[PDB]
Structures are given as C-alpha cells and as structure tokens.
Amino acid sequence: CYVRALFDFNGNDEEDLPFKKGDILRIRDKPEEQWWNAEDSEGKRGMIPVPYVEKYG
C-alpha cells in the first residue's frame, strides 16, 4: 500500500504530490494509469507518478 518515488519533485502545479528521489508514498487510489492518489510522509494525499514511483506495499 505504498510506492517508492525514485524521482524528486517539490513544487506546486496541479497539487501533484511532491517528494524526493527515494521517497515513499502510500497509494490508496489508482484512478489514472500513471497518476495515482497516494499519501506523503505526513498523510497528505496527492497525485503520485507511477512511472516515477515503484510498487512497494
């Protein structure tokens, strides 16, 4: 129920869930086929790149 973001990304464009190369995100929603809704290290649910993140849990 998590993913490892092997790509950095800290900004604020489309509310995309930011992260740092080698981060973990808890994916709970996977509507799109690349941008899934996962949580950050604070629970903040946002858009996470499946191509930039791996499947962990």
From Swiss-Prot:
Every SH3 domain range: 1-57
Cellular compartments annotated: Cytoplasm; Cell membrane
Annotated tissue distribution: Ubiquitous.
Post-translational modification: This leads finally to the down-regulation of the Crk signaling pathway. Isoform Crk-II: Phosphorylated by KIT.
Signal peptide limits: none
Subunit note: Component of a complex comprised of SH2D3C, BCAR1/CAS, and CRK. Within the complex, interacts with SH2D3C (via C-terminus), and BCAR1/CAS. Found in a complex with ABL1, ABL2, CRK and UNC119; leading to the inhibition of CRK phosphorylation by ABL kinases. Interacts with ABL1, C3G, DOCK3, DOCK5, MAP4K1, MAPK8 and SOS via its first SH3 domain. Interacts (via SH2 domain) with BCAR1, CBL, CBLB, PXN, IRS4 and GAB1 upon stimulus-induced tyrosine phosphorylation. Interacts (via SH2 domain) with several tyrosine-phosphorylated growth factor receptors such as EGFR and INSR.
Protein family: Belongs to the CRK family.
Comment, domains: The C-terminal SH3 domain function as a negative modulator for transformation and the N-terminal SH3 domain appears to function as a positive regulator for transformation. The SH2 domain mediates interaction with tyrosine phosphorylated proteins. Mediates interaction with SHB.
Entry function: Involved in cell branching and adhesion mediated by BCAR1-CRK-RAPGEF1 signaling and activation of RAP1. Isoform CRK-II: Regulates cell adhesion, spreading and migration. Mediates attachment-induced MAPK8 activation, membrane ruffling and cell motility in a Rac-dependent manner. Involved in phagocytosis of apoptotic cells and cell motility via its interaction with DOCK1 and DOCK4. May regulate the EFNA5-EPHA3 signaling.
Name listed for the protein in its UniProt record: Adapter molecule crk
Species, as recorded: Mus musculus (Mouse)
